[PDB]
Structure formats: C-alpha cells, structure tokens
mmCIF file of C-alpha atoms in Angstrom:
data_model
loop_
_atom_site.group_PDB
_atom_site.id
_atom_site.type_symbol
_atom_site.label_atom_id
_atom_site.label_comp_id
_atom_site.label_asym_id
_atom_site.label_seq_id
_atom_site.Cartn_x
_atom_site.Cartn_y
_atom_site.Cartn_z
ATOM 1 C CA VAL A 27 -128.171 -122.188 100.676
ATOM 2 C CA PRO A 28 -127.503 -125.938 100.858
ATOM 3 C CA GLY A 29 -130.585 -126.541 103.015
ATOM 4 C CA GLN A 30 -132.992 -124.987 100.489
ATOM 5 C CA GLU A 31 -133.705 -128.104 98.430
ATOM 6 C CA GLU A 32 -137.504 -128.358 98.567
ATOM 7 C CA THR A 33 -137.552 -124.609 97.880
ATOM 8 C CA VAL A 34 -135.820 -125.141 94.522
ATOM 9 C CA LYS A 35 -138.385 -127.757 93.498
ATOM 10 C CA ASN A 36 -141.225 -125.610 94.859
ATOM 11 C CA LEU A 37 -140.182 -122.679 92.669
ATOM 12 C CA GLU A 38 -139.318 -124.967 89.740
ATOM 13 C CA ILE A 39 -142.984 -125.961 89.526
ATOM 14 C CA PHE A 40 -143.907 -122.287 89.968
ATOM 15 C CA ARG A 41 -141.843 -121.275 86.930
ATOM 16 C CA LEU A 42 -143.317 -124.273 85.103
ATOM 17 C CA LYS A 43 -146.781 -123.092 86.154
ATOM 18 C CA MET A 44 -146.066 -119.590 84.836
ATOM 19 C CA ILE A 45 -144.843 -120.984 81.507
ATOM 20 C CA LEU A 46 -147.998 -123.068 81.044
ATOM 21 C CA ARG A 47 -150.222 -120.033 81.637
ATOM 22 C CA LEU A 48 -148.109 -118.136 79.097
ATOM 23 C CA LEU A 49 -148.992 -120.897 76.637
ATOM 24 C CA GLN A 50 -152.645 -120.468 77.644
ATOM 25 C CA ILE A 51 -152.425 -116.745 76.818
ATOM 26 C CA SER A 52 -154.351 -116.021 73.623
ATOM 27 C CA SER A 53 -151.618 -113.561 72.610
ATOM 28 C CA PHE A 54 -149.372 -115.101 69.960
ATOM 29 C CA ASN A 55 -146.350 -113.239 71.335
ATOM 30 C CA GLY A 56 -146.791 -114.947 74.700
ATOM 31 C CA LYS A 57 -147.147 -118.428 73.213
ATOM 32 C CA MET A 58 -143.997 -118.097 71.098
ATOM 33 C CA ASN A 59 -142.186 -116.622 74.104
ATOM 34 C CA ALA A 60 -143.428 -119.580 76.151
ATOM 35 C CA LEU A 61 -142.091 -122.123 73.649
ATOM 36 C CA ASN A 62 -138.720 -120.363 73.510
ATOM 37 C CA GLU A 63 -138.529 -120.650 77.297
ATOM 38 C CA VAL A 64 -139.609 -124.293 76.977
ATOM 39 C CA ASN A 65 -136.997 -124.734 74.242
ATOM 40 C CA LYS A 66 -134.351 -123.344 76.604
ATOM 41 C CA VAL A 67 -135.228 -125.475 79.638
ATOM 42 C CA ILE A 68 -135.228 -128.700 77.590
ATOM 43 C CA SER A 69 -131.674 -127.942 76.463
ATOM 44 C CA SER A 70 -130.765 -127.303 80.106
ATOM 45 C CA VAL A 71 -132.326 -130.670 80.991
ATOM 46 C CA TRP A 72 -132.784 -131.475 88.997
ATOM 47 C CA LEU A 73 -135.355 -131.546 86.189
ATOM 48 C CA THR A 74 -134.410 -134.805 84.487
ATOM 49 C CA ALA A 75 -135.527 -136.002 81.058
ATOM 50 C CA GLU A 76 -138.556 -137.844 82.470
ATOM 51 C CA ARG A 77 -139.985 -135.282 84.909
ATOM 52 C CA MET A 78 -140.341 -132.535 82.293
ATOM 53 C CA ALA A 79 -141.578 -135.069 79.735
ATOM 54 C CA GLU A 80 -144.210 -136.171 82.253
ATOM 55 C CA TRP A 81 -144.988 -132.538 83.118
ATOM 56 C CA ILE A 82 -145.793 -131.975 79.440
ATOM 57 C CA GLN A 83 -147.896 -135.149 79.337
ATOM 58 C CA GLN A 84 -150.486 -134.769 82.106
ATOM 59 C CA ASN A 85 -150.691 -131.006 81.517
ATOM 60 C CA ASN A 86 -151.470 -131.758 77.834
ATOM 61 C CA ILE A 87 -149.127 -129.023 76.620
ATOM 62 C CA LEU A 88 -149.033 -130.301 73.034
ATOM 63 C CA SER A 89 -152.829 -130.614 73.042
ATOM 64 C CA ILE A 90 -153.147 -126.855 73.564
ATOM 65 C CA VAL A 91 -150.247 -126.136 71.191
ATOM 66 C CA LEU A 92 -151.660 -128.104 68.255
ATOM 67 C CA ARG A 93 -155.071 -126.416 68.532
ATOM 68 C CA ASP A 94 -154.334 -123.184 66.643
ATOM 69 C CA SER A 95 -150.590 -122.437 66.826
ATOM 70 C CA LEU A 96 -149.821 -124.858 63.960
ATOM 71 C CA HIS A 97 -150.706 -122.190 61.366
ATOM 72 C CA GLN A 98 -147.146 -120.792 61.342
ATOM 73 C CA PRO A 99 -144.287 -122.943 59.974
ATOM 74 C CA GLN A 100 -141.703 -121.137 62.114
ATOM 75 C CA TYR A 101 -143.512 -122.131 65.317
ATOM 76 C CA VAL A 102 -143.748 -125.803 64.313
ATOM 77 C CA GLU A 103 -139.987 -126.017 63.738
ATOM 78 C CA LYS A 104 -139.432 -124.924 67.338
ATOM 79 C CA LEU A 105 -142.179 -127.356 68.384
ATOM 80 C CA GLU A 106 -140.287 -130.180 66.642
ATOM 81 C CA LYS A 107 -137.381 -130.236 69.101
ATOM 82 C CA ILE A 108 -139.472 -130.611 72.270
ATOM 83 C CA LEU A 109 -141.622 -133.316 70.673
ATOM 84 C CA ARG A 110 -138.405 -135.147 69.801
ATOM 85 C CA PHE A 111 -137.459 -134.822 73.473
ATOM 86 C CA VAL A 112 -140.822 -136.244 74.555
ATOM 87 C CA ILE A 113 -140.428 -139.176 72.152
ATOM 88 C CA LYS A 114 -136.821 -140.129 72.922
ATOM 89 C CA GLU A 115 -137.696 -141.172 76.499
ATOM 90 C CA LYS A 116 -141.010 -142.789 75.435
ATOM 91 C CA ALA A 117 -143.436 -140.242 76.849
ATOM 92 C CA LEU A 118 -145.820 -139.610 73.942
ATOM 93 C CA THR A 119 -148.912 -141.819 74.046
ATOM 94 C CA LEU A 120 -151.341 -143.204 71.484
ATOM 95 C CA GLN A 121 -153.918 -140.476 72.136
ATOM 96 C CA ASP A 122 -151.221 -137.849 71.564
ATOM 97 C CA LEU A 123 -150.701 -139.228 68.054
ATOM 98 C CA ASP A 124 -154.483 -139.220 67.584
ATOM 99 C CA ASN A 125 -154.500 -135.495 68.363
ATOM 100 C CA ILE A 126 -151.597 -135.087 65.928
ATOM 101 C CA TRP A 127 -153.671 -136.719 63.186
ATOM 102 C CA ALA A 128 -156.802 -134.864 64.325
ATOM 103 C CA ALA A 129 -155.253 -131.548 63.249
ATOM 104 C CA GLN A 130 -155.975 -132.343 59.586
ATOM 105 C CA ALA A 131 -159.688 -133.080 60.116
ATOM 106 C CA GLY A 132 -161.474 -130.596 57.865
ATOM 107 C CA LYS A 133 -159.212 -127.615 58.557
ATOM 108 C CA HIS A 134 -157.351 -125.318 56.180
ATOM 109 C CA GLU A 135 -154.928 -126.752 53.638
ATOM 110 C CA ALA A 136 -152.193 -124.616 55.205
ATOM 111 C CA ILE A 137 -151.871 -126.400 58.551
ATOM 112 C CA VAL A 138 -152.447 -129.948 57.283
ATOM 113 C CA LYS A 139 -149.160 -129.920 55.361
ATOM 114 C CA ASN A 140 -147.294 -128.533 58.385
ATOM 115 C CA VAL A 141 -148.728 -131.408 60.425
ATOM 116 C CA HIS A 142 -147.364 -133.616 57.652
ATOM 117 C CA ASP A 143 -144.077 -131.694 57.791
ATOM 118 C CA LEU A 144 -143.609 -132.259 61.528
ATOM 119 C CA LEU A 145 -144.585 -135.940 61.361
ATOM 120 C CA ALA A 146 -142.173 -136.598 58.485
ATOM 121 C CA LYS A 147 -139.294 -135.080 60.454
ATOM 122 C CA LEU A 148 -140.467 -136.886 63.612
ATOM 123 C CA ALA A 149 -140.901 -140.177 61.733
ATOM 124 C CA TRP A 150 -137.376 -141.493 62.313
ATOM 125 C CA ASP A 151 -137.582 -141.195 66.111
ATOM 126 C CA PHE A 152 -141.055 -142.756 66.318
ATOM 127 C CA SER A 153 -141.277 -146.241 67.786
ATOM 128 C CA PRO A 154 -142.597 -149.096 65.612
ATOM 129 C CA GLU A 155 -145.844 -149.051 67.603
ATOM 130 C CA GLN A 156 -146.158 -145.313 66.944
ATOM 131 C CA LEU A 157 -145.299 -145.774 63.262
ATOM 132 C CA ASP A 158 -147.865 -148.511 62.607
ATOM 133 C CA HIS A 159 -150.576 -146.561 64.445
ATOM 134 C CA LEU A 160 -149.820 -143.646 62.124
ATOM 135 C CA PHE A 161 -150.159 -146.029 59.170
ATOM 136 C CA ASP A 162 -153.447 -147.243 60.653
ATOM 137 C CA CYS A 163 -154.533 -143.604 60.911
ATOM 138 C CA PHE A 164 -153.559 -143.064 57.269
ATOM 139 C CA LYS A 165 -155.704 -145.994 56.116
ATOM 140 C CA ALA A 166 -158.644 -144.721 58.171
ATOM 141 C CA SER A 167 -158.110 -141.309 56.578
ATOM 142 C CA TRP A 168 -157.722 -143.017 53.190
ATOM 143 C CA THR A 169 -161.194 -144.547 53.549
ATOM 144 C CA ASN A 170 -162.822 -141.113 53.932
ATOM 145 C CA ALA A 171 -160.196 -139.230 51.902
ATOM 146 C CA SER A 172 -161.125 -136.820 49.125
ATOM 147 C CA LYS A 173 -159.370 -136.245 45.798
ATOM 148 C CA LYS A 174 -157.064 -133.545 47.167
ATOM 149 C CA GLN A 175 -156.808 -135.413 50.476
ATOM 150 C CA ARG A 176 -155.683 -138.656 48.819
ATOM 151 C CA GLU A 177 -152.793 -137.161 46.841
ATOM 152 C CA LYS A 178 -151.372 -135.274 49.825
ATOM 153 C CA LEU A 179 -151.606 -138.475 51.857
ATOM 154 C CA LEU A 180 -149.331 -140.060 49.251
ATOM 155 C CA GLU A 181 -147.233 -136.896 49.472
ATOM 156 C CA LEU A 182 -147.049 -137.522 53.219
ATOM 157 C CA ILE A 183 -146.486 -141.241 52.604
ATOM 158 C CA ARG A 184 -143.616 -140.578 50.195
ATOM 159 C CA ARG A 185 -142.206 -138.167 52.787
ATOM 160 C CA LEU A 186 -142.010 -141.136 55.162
ATOM 161 C CA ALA A 187 -139.760 -143.145 52.847
ATOM 162 C CA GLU A 188 -137.023 -140.933 51.385
ATOM 163 C CA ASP A 189 -135.913 -139.785 54.850
ATOM 164 C CA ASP A 190 -135.825 -143.381 56.140
ATOM 165 C CA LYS A 191 -132.159 -143.699 57.090
ATOM 166 C CA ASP A 192 -132.508 -147.460 57.676
ATOM 167 C CA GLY A 193 -134.636 -149.435 55.237
ATOM 168 C CA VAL A 194 -137.090 -150.759 57.830
ATOM 169 C CA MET A 195 -139.929 -148.223 57.814
ATOM 170 C CA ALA A 196 -139.788 -148.276 54.006
ATOM 171 C CA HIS A 197 -141.079 -151.866 53.965
ATOM 172 C CA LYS A 198 -144.344 -150.863 55.644
ATOM 173 C CA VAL A 199 -144.564 -147.777 53.412
ATOM 174 C CA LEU A 200 -144.294 -149.960 50.308
ATOM 175 C CA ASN A 201 -146.955 -152.269 51.757
ATOM 176 C CA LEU A 202 -149.376 -149.336 51.871
ATOM 177 C CA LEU A 203 -148.438 -148.421 48.297
ATOM 178 C CA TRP A 204 -149.038 -152.038 47.287
ATOM 179 C CA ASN A 205 -152.328 -152.015 49.213
ATOM 180 C CA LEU A 206 -153.442 -148.649 47.821
ATOM 181 C CA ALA A 207 -152.443 -149.297 44.201
ATOM 182 C CA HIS A 208 -154.244 -152.666 44.430
ATOM 183 C CA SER A 209 -157.341 -151.351 46.240
ATOM 184 C CA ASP A 210 -160.184 -151.305 43.709
ATOM 185 C CA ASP A 211 -162.249 -148.929 45.878
ATOM 186 C CA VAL A 212 -159.879 -146.066 44.964
ATOM 187 C CA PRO A 213 -160.105 -144.542 41.453
ATOM 188 C CA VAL A 214 -157.485 -144.973 38.752
ATOM 189 C CA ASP A 215 -156.055 -141.447 39.039
ATOM 190 C CA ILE A 216 -154.672 -142.336 42.472
ATOM 191 C CA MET A 217 -153.446 -145.715 41.178
ATOM 192 C CA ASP A 218 -150.665 -144.192 39.077
ATOM 193 C CA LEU A 219 -149.761 -141.741 41.858
ATOM 194 C CA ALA A 220 -149.459 -144.649 44.291
ATOM 195 C CA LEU A 221 -147.427 -146.551 41.694
ATOM 196 C CA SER A 222 -145.303 -143.508 40.829
ATOM 197 C CA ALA A 223 -144.485 -142.901 44.494
ATOM 198 C CA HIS A 224 -143.400 -146.542 44.727
ATOM 199 C CA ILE A 225 -141.212 -146.011 41.649
ATOM 200 C CA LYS A 226 -139.396 -142.984 43.071
ATOM 201 C CA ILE A 227 -139.178 -144.466 46.577
ATOM 202 C CA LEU A 228 -137.435 -147.486 45.056
ATOM 203 C CA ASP A 229 -135.317 -144.946 43.139
ATOM 204 C CA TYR A 230 -134.262 -142.319 45.696
ATOM 205 C CA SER A 231 -133.681 -144.823 48.523
ATOM 206 C CA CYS A 232 -130.781 -146.635 46.804
ATOM 207 C CA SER A 233 -128.318 -146.300 49.724
ATOM 208 C CA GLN A 234 -127.711 -149.942 50.644
ATOM 209 C CA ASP A 235 -131.383 -150.905 49.946
ATOM 210 C CA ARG A 236 -132.897 -150.964 46.415
ATOM 211 C CA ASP A 237 -131.638 -153.727 44.066
ATOM 212 C CA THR A 238 -131.578 -156.377 46.836
ATOM 213 C CA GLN A 239 -135.307 -155.746 47.480
ATOM 214 C CA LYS A 240 -135.816 -155.217 43.705
ATOM 215 C CA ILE A 241 -135.701 -158.946 42.921
ATOM 216 C CA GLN A 242 -137.899 -159.715 45.934
ATOM 217 C CA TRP A 243 -140.307 -156.892 45.102
ATOM 218 C CA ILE A 244 -140.393 -157.637 41.367
ATOM 219 C CA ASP A 245 -140.975 -161.335 42.091
ATOM 220 C CA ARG A 246 -143.729 -160.489 44.576
ATOM 221 C CA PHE A 247 -145.292 -158.346 41.848
ATOM 222 C CA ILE A 248 -145.206 -161.313 39.464
ATOM 223 C CA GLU A 249 -146.598 -163.483 42.267
ATOM 224 C CA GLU A 250 -149.476 -161.037 42.737
ATOM 225 C CA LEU A 251 -150.481 -161.427 39.085
ATOM 226 C CA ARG A 252 -149.974 -165.211 39.248
ATOM 227 C CA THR A 253 -153.528 -165.167 40.626
ATOM 228 C CA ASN A 254 -156.198 -163.697 38.349
ATOM 229 C CA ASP A 255 -158.303 -161.301 40.432
ATOM 230 C CA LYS A 256 -157.625 -158.076 38.484
ATOM 231 C CA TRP A 257 -154.254 -157.581 40.187
ATOM 232 C CA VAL A 258 -152.641 -158.126 36.782
ATOM 233 C CA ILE A 259 -153.403 -154.700 35.288
ATOM 234 C CA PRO A 260 -151.472 -152.803 38.014
ATOM 235 C CA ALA A 261 -148.893 -155.502 38.774
ATOM 236 C CA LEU A 262 -147.835 -156.076 35.161
ATOM 237 C CA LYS A 263 -147.088 -152.415 34.444
ATOM 238 C CA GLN A 264 -145.608 -151.927 37.931
ATOM 239 C CA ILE A 265 -142.926 -154.398 36.849
ATOM 240 C CA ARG A 266 -142.437 -152.518 33.577
ATOM 241 C CA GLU A 267 -140.948 -149.347 35.062
ATOM 242 C CA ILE A 268 -138.874 -151.464 37.454
ATOM 243 C CA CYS A 269 -137.336 -153.395 34.559
ATOM 244 C CA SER A 270 -136.828 -150.131 32.652
ATOM 245 C CA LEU A 271 -134.634 -148.779 35.468
ATOM 246 C CA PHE A 272 -133.555 -151.868 37.429
ATOM 247 C CA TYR A 273 -127.648 -156.029 35.176
ATOM 248 C CA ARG A 274 -130.741 -155.137 33.164
ATOM 249 C CA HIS A 275 -129.862 -156.970 29.942
ATOM 250 C CA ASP A 276 -129.180 -160.166 31.900
ATOM 251 C CA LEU A 277 -132.001 -159.399 34.358
ATOM 252 C CA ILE A 278 -134.574 -160.454 31.760
ATOM 253 C CA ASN A 279 -132.632 -163.704 31.402
ATOM 254 C CA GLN A 280 -132.345 -163.926 35.198
ATOM 255 C CA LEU A 281 -136.112 -163.399 35.447
ATOM 256 C CA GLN A 282 -136.588 -165.940 32.633
ATOM 257 C CA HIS A 283 -134.517 -168.778 34.139
ATOM 258 C CA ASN A 284 -137.216 -170.023 36.532
ATOM 259 C CA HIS A 285 -139.744 -167.157 36.803
ATOM 260 C CA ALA A 286 -140.042 -166.775 33.022
ATOM 261 C CA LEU A 287 -141.586 -163.421 32.153
ATOM 262 C CA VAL A 288 -142.553 -163.933 28.502
ATOM 263 C CA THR A 289 -143.863 -167.434 29.219
ATOM 264 C CA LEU A 290 -145.929 -166.554 32.300
ATOM 265 C CA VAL A 291 -147.596 -163.527 30.694
ATOM 266 C CA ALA A 292 -148.783 -165.862 27.925
ATOM 267 C CA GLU A 293 -151.042 -167.763 30.330
ATOM 268 C CA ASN A 294 -152.238 -164.503 31.901
ATOM 269 C CA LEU A 295 -153.378 -163.460 28.438
ATOM 270 C CA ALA A 296 -154.863 -166.922 27.907
ATOM 271 C CA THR A 297 -156.441 -167.198 31.354
ATOM 272 C CA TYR A 298 -158.252 -163.870 30.932
ATOM 273 C CA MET A 299 -159.260 -164.124 27.265
ATOM 274 C CA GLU A 300 -161.163 -167.258 28.268
ATOM 275 C CA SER A 301 -162.763 -165.442 31.215
ATOM 276 C CA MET A 302 -163.795 -162.515 29.016
ATOM 277 C CA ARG A 303 -165.337 -164.908 26.487
ATOM 278 C CA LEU A 304 -167.120 -166.848 29.247
ATOM 279 C CA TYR A 305 -169.490 -163.910 29.753
ATOM 280 C CA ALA A 306 -169.106 -162.702 26.152
ATOM 281 C CA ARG A 307 -171.924 -165.072 25.143
ATOM 282 C CA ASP A 308 -174.526 -163.808 27.645
ATOM 283 C CA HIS A 309 -173.143 -160.340 28.489
ATOM 284 C CA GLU A 310 -172.099 -159.343 24.956
ATOM 285 C CA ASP A 311 -174.358 -156.258 25.222
ATOM 286 C CA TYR A 312 -171.469 -154.238 26.635
ATOM 287 C CA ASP A 313 -168.521 -152.169 25.394
ATOM 288 C CA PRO A 314 -164.780 -152.903 25.068
ATOM 289 C CA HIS A 315 -161.328 -154.429 27.937
ATOM 290 C CA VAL A 316 -159.211 -152.570 25.387
ATOM 291 C CA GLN A 317 -156.982 -151.202 28.162
ATOM 292 C CA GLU A 318 -156.464 -154.745 29.443
ATOM 293 C CA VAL A 319 -155.418 -156.193 26.080
ATOM 294 C CA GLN A 320 -153.462 -153.077 25.094
ATOM 295 C CA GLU A 321 -151.341 -153.027 28.248
ATOM 296 C CA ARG A 322 -150.605 -156.760 28.304
ATOM 297 C CA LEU A 323 -149.140 -156.773 24.791
ATOM 298 C CA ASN A 324 -147.314 -153.530 25.587
ATOM 299 C CA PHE A 325 -145.422 -155.162 28.458
ATOM 300 C CA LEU A 326 -144.496 -158.174 26.320
#
C-alpha cells in the first residue's frame, strides 16, 4: 500500500526493538542470531547509513556486546563488519573506544588478544583522532602494565604497523617505540622488544616506505645520542641493526660525509668517560658501566 509509509517506519523500529532484546537475551544462541540479523540488515542498508548507526549508538549495542560475548573469536569477526559500518560514517565516539580498551582491564588473557585482534583490523578505518586516543590509551596502560601486559601491548603495537597500507599511522607507532625504548621507567627486557619491533616494522613495511625514512630515522637516532642523557646506550645499538640491514657499503661513507659515525662516537666515548670519572673520585665505592663501554666499542 503506497499510503502505508509511517507504518513501515513504525514496524522497522519494532523489528529493531526485537533484535535489541535478542541481544539482551542471556542465551548465546540468541545473541549470535541477533548479530547475524544485524549483519544482514547492515548489508541491506529507508534505513540509511546514519539512522542505523545512530540506533546502535544511543542504544549502546556495542557496550552490551563487548561485555561478555568477546570470548569467542568467531563472534568478534562478525562484530568487525558492523563496527566498520559504524566507523565509516563517523558514528563511534571517544567513550566507545574507552569501552573497547576497557575490555582488557584485568580479564582473562583469552579476550584481551581478541580485543587486540579487532582493533588491529579496525585500525585502518579509524580516524586520526581515534588513532591517537588509542595511542593515549596504550601509554596509560603502559604506565600500569605488567610484564605479560607490556609485551602483548608491543604485540598489539606491532599489529598496528604491518597492516598500515599507507605509511602515516606507522610514524606515530614508531614514536611510541622510540618513547618506550627510551623510557627509563621500563625495564631492559622490554627495551629490546620495543627495539626489535621497530626493527621488523622498518623491515616488513618496505612497500614505498622504508629506506626514505631510514636516513631520517637513522639520523634522528644519531641526533638523540648527540645529547648525553643515557639515550646513547639504546640509540647507538638501534642504529647498528639498521646499518646491518639498511647502498650499505656506501651508506657508511654517506653517513660519514657530514654526520660522521666513527668521528661522532669518539666524543660520545670521551664525553662519558669524563662523566664517569667525575664521580669516580667520590663514588668509587661502586661496581662496574661495563655494558656501556662494551657496547660502544662494539658498534665502532
């Protein structure tokens, strides 16, 4: 009937109401059936791309979904498509991402990686504001992170880089790796993991981005150790694996023309041997220091 227009929208909410209750059903069969029906209507999408996205928003559909249903990887994969739909018309909000990152707060190790799995696949469609807020959430998690929590954060962080189709998000990812590997508050066993992730991220992400940033990133690494505040120990070796992989025979000459590597390291040795001996007259009642001297000669 052509005249039954408000009737179609009246029932359309009624079916939407029934679906939401099906999500609210504690039965797992109902919730997966509800998502499949949600998965079908999104593909069909008078329900435009913004009305259903809004309908998910104020109803807090994902808030109920992420509570317990995340424990099954098969369910999350279906959940990925609708969340992509919510993102692509800019419907997800900051608090929604907070709930996404709240799913890893003290729960089982099973679901936390699936939350990482969904975010990594959702990373490309996230807006820059969404991406940086996630990085801010990572740093806040990093402050209270545990030993197992820190490594899987890097595992999540390295998941953000290899899938980066355009080398824009990778720049912020490398900034975190530079921040983390240079953050003295974090023990040494993470330091290598943060460095190693940077090594492979600069390795796997060749595409059209790798060597071009190499010179910039290797020079920035030299620049970091051009000031003596204990950045030298990580920065010097960080260069070493880069030079081992990233032409190489002329690269040493290219990095010796005006940013001389052998020459500059000589002062870094000199400028720290003096500093060590400054307190070696009053604080000599200590122990060797050896790692600092050993590594510096190793790089040279």
